[PDB]
Amino acid sequence: DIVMTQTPSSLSASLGGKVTITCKASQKINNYIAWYQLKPGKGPRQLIHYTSKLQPGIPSRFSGSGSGSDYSFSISNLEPEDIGTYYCLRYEDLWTFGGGTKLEIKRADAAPTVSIFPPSSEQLTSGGASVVCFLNNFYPKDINVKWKIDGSERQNGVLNSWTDQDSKDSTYSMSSTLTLTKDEYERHNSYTCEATHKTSTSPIVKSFNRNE
Amino acid sequence: QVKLEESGPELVKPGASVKISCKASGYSFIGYYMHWVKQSHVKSLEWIGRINPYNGATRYNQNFQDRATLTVDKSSSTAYMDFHSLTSEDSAVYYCVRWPGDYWGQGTSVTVSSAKTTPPSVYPLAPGSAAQTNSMVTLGCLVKGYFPEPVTVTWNSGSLSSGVHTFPAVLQSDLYTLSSSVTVPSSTWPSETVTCNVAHPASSTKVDKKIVPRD
Ligand code: NA
């Protein structure tokens, strides 16, 4: 194999802005480079082939250039939908993909909207008890969640999940779920979800009493 | 119009093999090389190899060469990828793609696991308090204990799209769990119905869960 060194591996830029990705081959590849866009839930979409030729329907704000072993790719007038991961490809015959560049849209900071949910009566009937906390539409993506049962931190039984960046409002969301047996859920009463985000030194606290 | 139509999702036990097909139409199949590409979250996009359909000559990524075999059925315009001795690291979406990389199949999801196909349990997420007399209300439903991926979640059969977040599934044991949220005006719920529709094609299950206030 050859090496296709794609750089940088991560991009963060503003709407209407411009970004540029470098792809450096370990030897001359004679302009047989292509650039792809990969969005979640979609297959790879070839934007540019043969260094600089756009594919049908691709707008001119996508551009590519280079020669020998140094190649570049640029997106101007960034749109929220441009979020995704971009790859160079040496496609002449033996293929080599670059490592990929993940593109983030920069935007104003936003505190998360935090919601906590008791276990449903339907789940408790089955012997289980999941406490769900949503932390929706925040920016930037860095965030930490703490669970407290009767004012005591809890780490076992917690599952976290983070969305990709929203293609519309450029925010992030995450879910934190504490799953217990029904027996363990009933011997405690106060369940607290605490979100710590850059937007405030003070955490956002949501909780409920099991006995309503 | 070039089309590459791949076979459906595959659930394979560890150590077993899988064979994926890719039916080409709209061009001379024996004329263009067929490539295969692996897409995973842990390894991004990896080339598997290519085949010249005319003579069957193949080239492989050295990482796959000992376990992957590319073949073609010339008379039926179909290309195959045979992958032996799979492990969980081989769970990924596999694409066939025609040279020069402009036409792609829709992809075949391969899950390598010993878990059995299992329908989800769907639980409502209603707030544990009364809504303020004029506020925005966040609801949801918990989709727990299904296999394999994926499930689809909509709200009111797609009529509620505002403020919807369906989070990526996480493995809770041998089974997947996710939640989906939706935010609606307090004037809309509970005076109007809010229902999350959960679909799990692998088990032919379609569940509607109406979200009702707690007490
Ligand atoms: Na350029």
Numbering used by the authors:
A (entry chain L): 1 to 94, 96 to 213
B (entry chain H): 1 to 52, 52A, 53 to 82, 82A, 82B, 82C, 83 to 97, 101 to 214
Give sentences copied directly from the paper behind this entry.
The serpinopathies are among a diverse set of conformational diseases that involve the aberrant self-association of proteins into ordered aggregates. α1-Antitrypsin deficiency is the archetypal serpinopathy and results from the formation and deposition of mutant forms of α1-antitrypsin as “polymer” chains in liver tissue. The misfolding of proteins and their spontaneous ordered aggregation underlie the pathology of Alzheimer’s, Huntington’s, and Parkinson’s diseases; amyloidoses; and serpinopathies—the latter involving self-association of mutant members of the serine protease inhibitor (serpin) superfamily. α1-Antitrypsin is a 52-kDa serpin expressed and secreted predominantly by hepatocytes and is the most abundant circulating protease inhibitor. However, genetic variants such as the severe Z (E342K) allele of α1-antitrypsin promote proteasomal degradation and the formation of ordered linear polymers. We have isolated polymers from the liver tissue of Z α1-antitrypsin homozygotes (E342K) who have undergone transplantation, labeled them using a Fab fragment, and performed single-particle analysis of negative-stain electron micrographs.
As the foundation of this analysis, an atomic model of the Fab-antigen complex was required. Protein crystallization trials of Fab4B12 were successful and yielded a 1.9 Å structure, with the crystallographic parameters summarized in table S1. The asymmetric unit contained two molecules, one of which exhibited fully defined variable loop regions. Despite extensive efforts, it was not possible to obtain a crystal structure of the α1-antitrypsin–Fab4B12 complex; SAXS data were collected instead. One thousand randomized starting orientations for α1-antitrypsin and Fab4B12 were subjected to rigid-body energy optimization with reference to these constraints and the Mon60,90 subunit map and scored according to both the cross-correlation coefficient (CCC) with the density and their correspondence with the SAXS profile (middle). Backbone and side-chain flexibility was conferred on regions of the Fab likely to contribute to the interface (heavy chain: 27 to 33, 51 to 57, 71 to 76, and 94 to 102; light chain: 27 to 32, 49 to 54, 66 to 70, and 91 to 94) and α1-antitrypsin side chains within the boundaries of the epitope. The five models that maximized these metrics showed an unambiguous polarity (right). One model was selected that best represented this cluster by root mean square distance comparison with the others. This showed the heavy-light chain partition to be oriented off-center along helix A, with the variable-constant domain axis perpendicular to the long axis of the serpin [Fig. 4, A (right) and B (left)]. The cleft between the variable and constant domains of Fab4B12 aligned closely with a central “dimple” exhibited by the monomer density (denoted by an asterisk in the figure), and the complex corresponded well with the experimentally determined SAXS profile (right).
